[PDB]
Amino acid sequence: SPCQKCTSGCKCATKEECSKTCTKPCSCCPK
Ligand SMILES: [Cd+2]
Ligand SMILES: [Cd+2]
Numbered sequence: 001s002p003c004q005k006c007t008s009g010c011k012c013a014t015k016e017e018c019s020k021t022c023t024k025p026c027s028c029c030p031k
């Protein structure tokens with residue numbers, strides 16, 4: 001489940017950015 005900034009805004013392209021706004025692969029980050 002994506003945070004309050006990943007829905008229409010998954011700005012994570014690599015875990016280097018994903019691990020910066022999130023803590024894990026929301027329902028949209030990498031898999
Ligand atoms: Cd997120
Ligand atoms: Cd993320």
Ligand SMILES: [Cd+2]
Nearest residue numbers: 006010028029
């Ligand atoms: Cd995401």
